[PDB]
Design a binder for this molecule. Sequence first.
Ligand SMILES: NC(=O)c1ccc[n+]([C@@H]2O[C@H](COP(=O)([O-])OP(=O)(O)OC[C@H]3O[C@@H](n4cnc5c(N)ncnc54)[C@H](O)[C@@H]3O)[C@@H](O)[C@H]2O)c1
Ligand SMILES: [Mg+2]
Length: 318
Amino acid sequence: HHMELRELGATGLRVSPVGFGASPLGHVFGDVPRDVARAAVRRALDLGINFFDTSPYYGGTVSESVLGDCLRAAGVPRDRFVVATKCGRYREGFDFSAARVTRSVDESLARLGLDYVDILHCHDIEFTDLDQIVNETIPVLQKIKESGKARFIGITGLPLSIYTYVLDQVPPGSVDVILSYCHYGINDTALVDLLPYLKSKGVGVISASPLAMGLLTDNGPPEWHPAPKELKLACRAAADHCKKKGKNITKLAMQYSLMNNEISTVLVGMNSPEQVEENVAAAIELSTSGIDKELLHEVEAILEPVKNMTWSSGIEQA
Ligand SMILES: NC(=O)c1ccc[n+]([C@@H]2O[C@H](COP(=O)([O-])OP(=O)(O)OC[C@H]3O[C@@H](n4cnc5c(N)ncnc54)[C@H](O)[C@@H]3O)[C@@H](O)[C@H]2O)c1
Ligand SMILES: [Mg+2]
């Protein structure tokens, strides 16, 4: 069994439904040895994952250096995989200006050891005036796209409102994809309200953080996690409910995020071959056998009170 590739917007690209996020929980592949990173990526390639997301932000540009390292190490044709990186967000702060993103793409390419990336996104745009993205950044990224250094252009961020603001205010065709996170998983599925709109605009959809950055795991979220306490407690109840039955919330959550074919890929942060295996397995078992609907229904009931509860991100707008 393979995983069933999905079409990504109007880009032509065919992507694995499970995608590899190269920085889980805001760390470059967690904090695992390089050999383990290299092996996770190797294992991902071997198991039919062909989509890799990174950025110059998490780990101060080392996410990209390590992914570049891991990719060429695995030794596979350039056209066998799809890479996305981002621009605008750096450890030293945000800068979406024309000169910064133009040099950004080159730096990324140098760190990644590639000639082009498949996707370049503007990163977490809720941290700047959204008119700068409309009026400066997107235009510049067209020129980067023209140059060949990126094939397609993306926007990313947390609040779903960034996406209508931008996509309403740029000429049709300016943006190829969006990356949304934390809005397509058992506790939060608000992204669904955008899929028809984005389809109407010819924009492909990538979703990320199907476990909501660790809320839907046995281990629980990191201490920094910005969720309201209510959501944290509800997710702990869901995890405990699965546990007491000898079942795994992580698996249920991954499968759940994969059940909407209008989302082309779900980026999961992964740090080891074992996590790759479990998530690829979860995808395949969904395809071949379906989800556990009875467990899903009970977990849905626990999360019901906190459905689509979110948190603040970015700055005050216009
Ligand atoms: N604005 C943006 O563009 C933005 C922001 C957030 C995330 N992302 C992307 O999405 C990716 C995924 O998000 P995330 O990693 O923060 O959150 P997530 O919800 O994907 O959870 C990742 C966590 O779950 C653990 N995990 C994964 N599979 C597991 C399994 N089978 N069993 C047990 N634990 C498992 C990981 O080790 C990690 O701690 C990121 O690496 C990144 O590429 C994009
Ligand atoms: Mg404004």
